[PDB]
Design an enzyme around this catalytic site. Structure first.
Site, PDB file in Angstrom:
ATOM      1  N   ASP A   1       0.627  -1.383  -0.411  1.00  0.00           N
ATOM      2  CA  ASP A   1      -0.290  -0.473   0.034  1.00  0.00           C
ATOM      3  C   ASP A   1       0.641   1.223   0.503  1.00  0.00           C
ATOM      4  OD1 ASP A   1      -1.925   1.830   0.116  1.00  0.00           O
ATOM      5  OD2 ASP A   1      -2.768   1.451   2.299  1.00  0.00           O
TER       6      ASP A   1
ATOM      7  N   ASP B   1       8.679   0.484   5.997  1.00  0.00           N
ATOM      8  CA  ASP B   1       8.130   1.580   4.976  1.00  0.00           C
ATOM      9  C   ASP B   1       9.517   2.160   5.544  1.00  0.00           C
ATOM     10  OD1 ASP B   1       5.613   0.895   4.296  1.00  0.00           O
ATOM     11  OD2 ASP B   1       4.872   2.206   6.069  1.00  0.00           O
TER      12      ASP B   1
ATOM     13  N   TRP C   1       3.707   2.217   8.973  1.00  0.00           N
ATOM     14  CA  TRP C   1       4.547   1.369   9.596  1.00  0.00           C
ATOM     15  C   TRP C   1       5.523   1.941   9.227  1.00  0.00           C
ATOM     16  CZ3 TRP C   1       2.463  -2.292  12.821  1.00  0.00           C
ATOM     17  CH2 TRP C   1       1.477  -2.843  12.493  1.00  0.00           C
TER      18      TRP C   1
ATOM     19  N   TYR D   1       5.201   8.173   5.539  1.00  0.00           N
ATOM     20  CA  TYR D   1       5.090   8.120   4.395  1.00  0.00           C
ATOM     21  C   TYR D   1       5.766   8.587   3.020  1.00  0.00           C
ATOM     22  CZ  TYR D   1       4.540   4.268   1.050  1.00  0.00           C
ATOM     23  OH  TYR D   1       4.690   3.179   0.663  1.00  0.00           O
TER      24      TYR D   1
ATOM     25  N   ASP E   1      -3.191  -0.097   5.758  1.00  0.00           N
ATOM     26  CA  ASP E   1      -3.132   1.522   5.715  1.00  0.00           C
ATOM     27  C   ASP E   1      -2.745   1.760   6.591  1.00  0.00           C
ATOM     28  OD1 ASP E   1      -5.054   0.602   3.555  1.00  0.00           O
ATOM     29  OD2 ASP E   1      -7.186   0.202   5.336  1.00  0.00           O
TER      30      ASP E   1
ATOM     31  N   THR F   1       7.405   2.085   0.412  1.00  0.00           N
ATOM     32  CA  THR F   1       7.064   0.626   0.838  1.00  0.00           C
ATOM     33  C   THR F   1       8.350  -0.098  -0.293  1.00  0.00           C
ATOM     34  OG1 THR F   1       5.165   1.186   1.346  1.00  0.00           O
ATOM     35  CG2 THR F   1       6.143  -1.305   1.514  1.00  0.00           C
TER      36      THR F   1
ATOM     37  N   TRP G   1       4.202  -5.088   8.296  1.00  0.00           N
ATOM     38  CA  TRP G   1       2.529  -5.910   7.616  1.00  0.00           C
ATOM     39  C   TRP G   1       3.470  -6.730   6.716  1.00  0.00           C
ATOM     40  CZ3 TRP G   1       4.073  -1.434   4.902  1.00  0.00           C
ATOM     41  CH2 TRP G   1       3.562  -1.768   3.595  1.00  0.00           C
TER      42      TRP G   1
END
Ligand code: HEC
Ligand code: HEC
Ligand code: HEC
Ligand code: HEC
Ligand code: CA
Ligand code: CA
Ligand code: NA
Ligand code: NA
Ligand code: NA
Ligand code: NA
Lengths: 357, 376, 125, 129, 376, 354
Positions: D26, D70, D102, D113, D99, D116, D51
């Protein structure tokens, strides 16, 4: 009737028999050869004018009567801004209410009262004839009627095209009959994009048919006392000219120190400037505005004195929002503004621009 | 026929022709009403974001609010104020973090409070409306903290101060029911009821477990604080309804929003704000389309409307666009707002017919979250 | 649609980039974020500074001076972006230059650009 | 480009949203802003939190645990945005939820963010999925 | 023809098959070099902005730098650092303004300095490269101030401190020529040479007026600090060239970028960075197109290349896209960079043939400024 | 050769004739019935072991030998992290170098030196035959060859499948032969997504062929002294165990307090835990990590003592970047981890799980 009433006003305007010692007519302080302002020197220069006693000086500068007929009657608009009226503090509602006041002011024409005015009007068979034709038989026997009629005639005379001819270069240019010099054109562009436009244009937006370069509002721009004038006027070292707050019925202390935005028409020929005639040169008046914007030390100095402008006479209610524009006028833009403001001189006063230039 | 821009051109020309003056000035937004809708743009995780205030009736933007990193908007149901919990950094996306709450006047849009949250305690996640929540009295804002553990922060909007963090068990979301109590959803499959005094560990009470481990409840349930109704769809369009009006949780008959043959032919809910609940109509709206099991965040082109007490499908609308988020105005004859993240457009639908009435485009970068006040 | 073609003013839609008063706008039309043709949106602050252009009004055959003003103190609206440059001069003739963020004089010292208004201030001459 | 169709992994282009390892990514593929499949771009901070997902690799037919991590402390890159959700579970199962930002454990407390990464941390089979 | 993302998949697949371990970590960008190119995205006046650091040879984004409102990027010509003067506010776009300069390491991209500018002194303007400028030694950053009056701010990058504001005449842009000197262009049609110390009234000298009042000189002249060459187009594609290499201004012969017949047929330059200058080749590149006279900020689809000495046209490239800005690498066989604000794509062209070689897309919202280092 | 070597090491491993008083074998402390750890209660409980003399206690917990053969030989990798070796402080390069140290340690087996070890080897006719066949005639008459050969046999024996059978449930699950329970699976998912995998996994990415739940690095996790163990050891209350820094040739002050990441294989049956056996329960060991993450009062208290954990024995070089992960293990995750960790028990010790 319209013609005749003004023609009567024409006669009264120049008639010194309306002053106690018969030395002074409106025209003495509002001299037609000077865009209806006072060319006479007094104890404070041309800042303030001398009355019929030859000794009494006012505390404010004699304003032009040119274009004064375009000023709306005094009122408060929907946004709580006062607008219009006559006198620098708007204390007269309109020209007619204004007209009788110099007559009876012991610092001006000093007639003792209305009856003395009417006795003078009666002495002159042309006035019996002229007043009677317009206002009826015996008008001059009734001091209240005679005085009101004289004011009306004088207000009418000031509403004629002679007082507001709109024949300045600026007018000619806006008709397409000629063009601005490039300096004048830059001056106009500055005037209309800088903060001057927030106060010295009739309208907030759109185009006015008879622009007189004032929005007729009341602003404290934080002028200092004119000390020589204030001394001559004799009002005292502790006196504060509260501007609009002096108008009877105005009680709001936020109006303290605010004065009517003058028309800039004929500004070039009606120095000295501001309500107390404090600045003698048009360029100075413009430069005063840099004190709110410039970070240069010189922006705090009156160039006519070399000293600080001085503390505001009234330090509160300044128009800081408009005045603190964030942008300083450089000399080229000040020059431009001078050139543009000179274009606001009526055709017949153009020969006066030579000496001021 | 005549658009807003056209009407405005004509009014301006008339004012010019008439010699009408007007003062350039800062406008006031129209008073908050039922048709006001707020669209939040998390802007695909950008550091600054925007909220659009929109008059749903005219389909006009009537103002905007700027926000920080993944802010949580809230709108007081009574229209009296809006607020967000937001996060800024001293150098765009780096440096000292400041989490804060702002409360805004809903017509000047001016901030009336700016309340710093100590120790950067906000949960940074794609925007879940019920991760930050107003108590019904509007006096308190509760926000979720995930790190170091689930916790809930109490912010006094009246005194304009942060109060304290509540320790909770392993739970998520915040559904306030009263000035001192809210529910959360726990990992073990219960709801937890958290009652906080001014001091001390709060009192925490688990419901029964109400869904199995392999039943997945979406991150965007609908919650009507005035109705006490928590509407919680699962991945399959199964819908838990939980009544919290009494002060305690009671579980309404579970409902299915899709039929077996739809399931079988691949219909599943999908999107962001997949579900809307209209309080007075006691009605549920669910974004659905034909999709694989694991495409549950994709846009949908259909909305099914179902009665909350029966489960009966009342409509199926073909939205005519790719819709990520839905909500409704809470008035009579409500609008159904269908926000397309991809089109950056709020499509404004008649919730009755599903007809597209109007739309407001250019709503930021990745708008996702529609909020309305329930003013009735 | 042809970006390089001579700009053709209209006086029928203020949100479009060919609206006659927008002949030198740069940014976003305020009418599209909750302001109006000549007013700022809520929460923003109205600058006192302006740039000017002479814009032809096809309704009346007259050219008017439009003294643009910015609404400041918010991030750019992102709605109804337009850039027109009729008579637009470079930065050294700043009264006719439109890349400048003309937020000066705005309350609270606001200097971020949100959108621009298009008020008339006179007839062109 | 049918957004709702079953996602079909490929093992031929990591900047594409259908790259097998991105099965529950994400945000933005780090490889498009100066990172790589498994490294963060310069200036950003690598989180220690993740995750995870079990992602099927079409090439060997094995399923691998991808523990997404991330890269934080920058505004979102804006290049190669992707959202996939293979095995993705809601926030109350945070170990599989995507969502969440992380960014925990990232140096300097970075929590914004940027993008990733998609590294492998094991072989898989989860009960869900 | 294999893409970078394909090559990366191939390589990752091989490491998996081979059992190859590698530590996840923060990459360093490749060392700066001649084919590095920076694209700044002013993002159409957004509060926050981005710069993309690009390998022009590979057409790969190798990093990014975040910025605030209309930051001014500078790149040290020797590759040793990059910097920007930036502006943030305490609440996104509202509140306390802080202007500051950051200096960054060009491989880790970490800020090595963050230097506050007192009294919020930056000129907020659509980005003009030469409104913030490094002295040739890299030790001083000069930034323009417009309000309350034209002034120039001096920042010591070596001491990491703001130094002073300089009062200047009614002039614009900053073309530094020495550690203590720079030129500006004045309203009166002259250039102003400004020489300044740590304290004292700077020495200001004007050249002759070099263009008439009605010949308009674009906001994006190209300036090669290493050549002292100021290349200043007019609206008509007339090009003034000013040689500052002697430390005083010499006016070079004007050239026309377009022919009379082209000009008779409506050819004019237009865009943003309309002009580039390749030092080693002494070549001017100008974005031109057929356009009305007042569409001068629109994109153009053609680049004319001309010999700066003679004005001889060397090429007219059909760029094949809507190009707003151009720049060139300053190496041999340069790349011609053609940035489309509307496509948010840098197209990278062979500057000799004009052929498009590759492109880097998704460069923000409204990218407009290309900067390269002149490392040779 | 390889069979026979290991088979000789098997004899030696259980032979108490390699201790001074002939009371102690490797197997006394590394008891095969307790995953090669010490079941014997001493002074300081099980935290430390007693030598041949019946009174000397060590200052470290006796570790399992299972899977020790998978540890690389001690080396500094290209990132500057030391890895591998044997003993908690990595001071032995490998198994072979480790094997002779207990034999001669006065606090352990207490043989006076190598010749005494040889002589005991010559007492046993079986050893003369076994050693001679593998290393040649007279091996036992040369103390150095005899001792190296004993060490080689011991190492070879520890490299046998018997010490590293990879038959834990975890192994069976990763072969697809068995599934984790939901709790074990949660525990595994937590293990690999939380900070534990930053240290208790062989690799940074990809999949290990023979996972032993250690990256073989050295970390100071900030443990307190085990006061009673330390008392019993007789090292002084002023003594500081510097972990890796005590390895000869390591001078880098950054290595003070760092200990080798243990394999978590068999962790469930090898308590007490950590290098000093300070925690008796596996749950406690796991909870120790919360002291870096959790801002709850309970996190500061050792649940076995009811008192604060204690200041680190070595306050410097804590692995804070790893340990301060920003997330606290709730009781549920601690349970899940326990369960997962128990799956790393070799088949033969599954009966020991209660
Ligand atoms: C002794 C000099 C003098 C004489 C004589 C005099 N005025 Fe004035 N006039 C002034 C001064 C001074 C003011 C400003 C006073 C104030 O603001 O309080 C003034 C103000 C006015 C104004 C207000 C204009 C404005 O813009 O506010 C009008 C109208 C006016 N005079 C008309 C007349 C008429 C008509 C007469 C003869 C009936 C007259 N004046 C006689 C000095 C004089
Ligand atoms: C905030 C309102 C406002 C602004 C802005 C302002 N003026 Fe004025 N101006 C006044 C008022 C009010 C007076 C009379 C002040 C007084 O005498 O007390 C005045 C007086 C003047 C005068 C003297 C006229 C006379 O007859 O005595 C000149 C000249 C003038 N202004 C020029 C300008 C120019 C040029 C600008 C733009 C630089 C400007 N003003 C901006 C309100 C303003
Ligand atoms: C008195 C009890 C005792 C006896 C007897 C003993 N050990 Fe140990 N063993 C320990 C202790 C305690 C440690 C940890 C010592 C340290 O780290 O300094 C240890 C550590 C080791 C290690 C390193 C394990 C690791 O992970 O680091 C190996 C291998 C080992 N022993 C093998 C043997 C062999 C082979 C013998 C027989 C020659 C033996 N031990 C005899 C107690 C004993
Ligand atoms: C910073 C690297 C690191 C991290 C992260 C870490 N450990 Fe450890 N772990 C170690 C080291 C080193 C030891 C031995 C410490 C000592 O005795 O000095 C250890 C010891 C243990 C022990 C005791 C083993 C034995 O034989 O005594 C257990 C159980 C354990 N860890 C589990 C975990 C779990 C579960 C996590 C995740 C919460 C975790 N560890 C995180 C490095 C780490
Ligand atoms: Ca005067
Ligand atoms: Ca142990
Ligand atoms: Na005076
Ligand atoms: Na009064
Ligand atoms: Na103890
Ligand atoms: Na050492």
């Amino acid at each position: 009737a319209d013609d005749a009433l003004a023609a009567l006003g024409a006669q009264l305007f120049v008639d010194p028999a309306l002053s106690r010692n018969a030395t002074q007519s409106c025209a003495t302080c509002h001299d037609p050869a000077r865009a209806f302002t006072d060319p006479r020197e007094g104890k404070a220069g041309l800042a303030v004018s001398v009355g019929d006693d030859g000794q009494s000086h006012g505390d404010r500068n004699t304003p032009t009567l040119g274009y004064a007929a375009l000023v709306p009657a005094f009122h408060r608009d929907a946004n709580g801004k006062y607008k219009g009226g006559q006198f620098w503090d708007g204390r007269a509602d309109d020209l007619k209410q204004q007209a009788g006041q110099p007559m009876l002011n012991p610092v001006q024409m000093a007639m003792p009262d209305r009856a003395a005015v009417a006795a003078r009007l009666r002495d002159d068979p042309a006035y019996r004839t002229g007043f009677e034709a317009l206002f009826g038989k015996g008008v001059l026997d009734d001091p209240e009627r005679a005085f009101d009629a004289a004011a009306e005639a004088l207000a009418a005379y000031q509403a004629t095209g002679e007082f507001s001819p709109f024949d300045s270069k600026y007018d000619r240019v806006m008709r397409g009959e000629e063009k601005f010099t490039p300096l004048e054109e830059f001056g106009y562009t500055v005037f209309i994009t800088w903060n001057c436009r927030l106060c010295h244009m009739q309208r907030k937006q759109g185009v006015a048919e008879r622009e007189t370069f004032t929005n007729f509002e009341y602003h404290n721009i934080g002028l200092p006392v004119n000390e020589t004038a204030r001394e001559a006027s004799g009002l005292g070292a502790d006196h504060v000219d509260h501007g609009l707050l002096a108008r009877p019925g105005i009680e709001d202390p936020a109006q303290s120190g605010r004065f009517k935005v003058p028309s800039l028409r004929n500004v070039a020929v009606t120095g000295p400037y501001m309500h107390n005639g404090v600045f003698t040169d048009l360029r100075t008046a413009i430069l005063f505005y840099n004190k709110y914007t410039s970070r240069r030390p010189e922006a705090k100095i009156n160039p006519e004195t070399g000293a600080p402008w001085g503390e505001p006479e009234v330090a509160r209610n300044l128009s800081l929002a408009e005045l603190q524009s964030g942008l300083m006028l450089d000399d080229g833009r000040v020059d431009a503004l001078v050139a543009f403001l000179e274009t606001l001189t009526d055709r017949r006063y153009e020969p006066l621009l030579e000496e001021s230039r | 026929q005549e658009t807003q821009g056209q009407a405005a051109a004509r009014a301006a020309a008339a004012d010019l022709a008439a010699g009408q003056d007007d003062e350039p000035r800062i406008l006031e937004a129209p008073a908050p009403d039922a048709r006001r809708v707020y669209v939040n743009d998390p802007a695909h995780f950008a550091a600054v974001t925007q909220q659009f205030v929109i008059d749903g009736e005219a389909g006009r933007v009537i103002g905007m609010i700027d926000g920080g990193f993944l802010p949580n908007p809230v709108v007081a149901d009574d229209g009296s104020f809006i607020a967000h919990a937001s996060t800024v950094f001293s150098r765009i996306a780096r440096g000292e973090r400041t989490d804060y709450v702002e409360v805004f006047d809903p017509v000047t849009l001016l901030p009336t409070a700016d309340i710093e949250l100590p120790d950067a305690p906000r949960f940074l996640v794609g925007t879940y409306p019920w991760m930050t929540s107003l108590t019904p009295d509007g006096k308190t804002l509760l926000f979720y903290q995930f790190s170091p553990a689930p916790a809930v922060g109490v912010v006094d909007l009246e005194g304009k101060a942060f109060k304290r963090m509540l320790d909770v068990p392993d739970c998520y979301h915040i559904f306030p029911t009263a000035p001192d109590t809210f529910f959360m959803h726990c990992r073990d499959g219960s709801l937890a009821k958290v009652a906080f005094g001014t001091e001390g560990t709060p009192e925490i009470t688990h419901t029964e477990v109400f869904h199995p481990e392999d039943e997945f409840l979406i991150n965007h349930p609908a919650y009507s604080q005035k109705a006490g109704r928590l509407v919680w769809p699962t991945y399959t369009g199964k819908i838990h309804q939980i009544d919290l009006s009494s002060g305690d949780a009671k579980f309404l008959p579970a409902v299915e929003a899709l039929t077996e043959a739809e399931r079988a032919d691949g219909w599943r809910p999908g999107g962001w704000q997949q579900v809307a609940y209209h309080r007075a109509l006691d009605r549920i709206y669910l974004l659905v389309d034909q999709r694989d099991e694991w495409r549950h965040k994709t846009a949908s082109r259909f909305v099914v409307v179902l009665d909350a007490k029966t489960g009966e499908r009342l409509a199926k609308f073909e939205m005519g666009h790719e819709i990520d988020s839905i909500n409704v105005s809470q008035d009579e004859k409500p609008l159904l707002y269908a926000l397309s993240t991809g089109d950056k457009t709020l499509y404004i639908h008649d919730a009755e017919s599903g007809e597209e009435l109007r739309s407001v485009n250019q709503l930021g970068h990745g708008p996702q979250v529609i909020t309305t006040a329930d003013m009735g | 649609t042809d970006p390089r073609a001579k700009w053709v003013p209209q006086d029928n839609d203020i949100q479009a980039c060919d609206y006659w008063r927008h002949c030198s706008i740069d940014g976003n039309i305020c009418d599209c974020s909750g302001g109006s043709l000549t007013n700022c949106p809520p929460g923003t602050k109205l600058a006192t500074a302006s740039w000017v252009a002479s814009c032809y009004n096809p309704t009346d055959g007259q050219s008017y001076l439009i003294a643009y003003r910015d609404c400041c103190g918010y991030n750019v609206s992102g709605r109804c972006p337009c850039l027109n440059t009729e008579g637009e001069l470079p930065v050294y003739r700043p009264e006719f230059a439109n890349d400048i963020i003309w937020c000066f004089g705005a309350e609270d010292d606001a200097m971020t650009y949100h959108c621009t208004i298009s008020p008339i201030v006179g007839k062109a001459s």
